[PDB]
Amino acid sequence: LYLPTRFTSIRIDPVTHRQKLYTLQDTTQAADVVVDRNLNTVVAGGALFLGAHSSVAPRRPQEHLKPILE
Amino acid sequence: GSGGVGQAAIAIALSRGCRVFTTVGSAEKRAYLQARFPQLDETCFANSRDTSFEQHVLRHTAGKGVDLVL
């Protein structure tokens, strides 16, 4: 389980974004995402991440879900 | 690399047989250097007026990076 913790450089440009977007046959709207783990950069439409370091979190056992063992 | 301490750094770092990566502002400096040191690939050159050199080093390094930066 991994939450975000640091970004090094996010860069959003809503103009290029409107543009980078398209329309599926669904009639819905989507754009292409790409992850380059060797460069640590996620891009999608008009939002470009860089060094978006996420990190571990402790699963907290909710004991209103302890199983009945028979 | 194009400059004073740059060129000596290359020459020295080369003498001890190393993968080199240099940055340089001119298209012409790409020239002088490529000439002066034959042991340089086109993979060896990235820009210097800009942050692009990071992405570049991170590619031809397989996301491992360089051992010393000058």
Note the topology.
The structure is cut from a larger assembly and holds two copies of chain A (70 residues).
Chain A: E1 2-6, E2 11-12, H1 14-20, E3 22-23, E4 29-30, E5 33-35, E6 42-44, E7 47-48, E8 53-56
Antiparallel strand pairs in A: 1-8, 2-7, 3-4, 5-6, 6-7
Pair of chains with the largest interface and how many residues each contributes:
A-B, 5 and 6 residues
Q: From the structure provided, what is the oligomeric state, counting identical versus distinct chains?
A: part of a larger assembly
Helix run count of chain A:
1
- Head-to-tail CA distance between termini of chain A: 31 Å
Globally, the shape of chain A reads: flat
Portion in strands of chain A: 25-35%
Class per helix and strand makeup of chain A: mainly beta
Strand order of the largest sheet of chain A: 2-7-6-5
- Sequence of secondary-structure elements of chain A: EEHEEEEEE
The main β sheet of chain A shows up as: 4 strands, antiparallel
Over all CA atoms, what is the radius of gyration of chain A? 19 Å
Find the count of extended strands of chain A (DSSP E, 2+ residues): 8
Q: Helix coverage percent of residues of chain A?
A: 10-25%
